[PDB]
Amino acid sequence: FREVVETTIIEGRITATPKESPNPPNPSGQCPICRWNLKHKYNYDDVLLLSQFIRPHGGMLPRKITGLCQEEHRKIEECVKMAHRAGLLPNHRPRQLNRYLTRWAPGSVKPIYKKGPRWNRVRMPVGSPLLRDNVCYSRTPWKLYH
């Protein structure tokens, strides 16, 4: 990566470029997810995968730089949102209720004062439906609404 060193002087210094591991097990895949057999096999828990696509101040990287699938870019974008809120990315700050699997922004959701009748009940969203097609090792699928 390159940095913008300044003090009045402003210069740009290419510093310490990484590289991807030499042997993708699925070469001639397209996305770096697709190349490494990870099309449905990651969640918000595993932050070693999420952290590689994140700006050091917590934001996402654009799809052109990462070269992701469109699908997997929305999935990682969502999982990174769901992992900032569970406090799994503490060092991606710019400078207390425990959550996990939060689809919406916590300061934006009106409380359910009238949960409906049994045939029209307002449910609470848990997790994201972008992560439907993950490998469920249970028989029941993910309940996305509690």
Partner: protein, 177 residues
Amino acid sequence: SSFSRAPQQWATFARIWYLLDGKMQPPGKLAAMASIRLQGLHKPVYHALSDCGDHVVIMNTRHIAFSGNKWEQKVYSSHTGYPGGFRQVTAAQLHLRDPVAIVKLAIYGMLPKNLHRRTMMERLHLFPDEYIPEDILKNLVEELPQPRKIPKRLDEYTQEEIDAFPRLWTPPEDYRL
């Protein structure tokens, strides 16, 4: 076997204090374990009339963890019987009032809706912190495993755990971050 009648009978129906750490746990998934041990449904000697419930000590119930936006959406509604006395309060506000009441209401809803329910609630001991009284610490027998596996964060991965995971993609040599 080969006990006398009275100490065998004492041994079988004796009740056991369980500890249950509720840090980073969901309250309903604590409430299920707690409810089973409060009714005595984890004993093969169980019967409804035989009164064989246990004690459940749940600690760290300030440190519960709702899944999804249940902190901001889930509503606890009560009514003082007076007119205009209907009080709906979200899970966050009620957790700032009393850091026991979410786990307490969860368990209290799980238990069978009968008259044994409040004797069962007087067997459950909720504490919001690491601090448990000494008279209760001298009763505990087994600590139950937490039902949710707390996912570790990026600070808590060791170096070899980070190194074992591959870098997936080559960044461009000139990109700013």
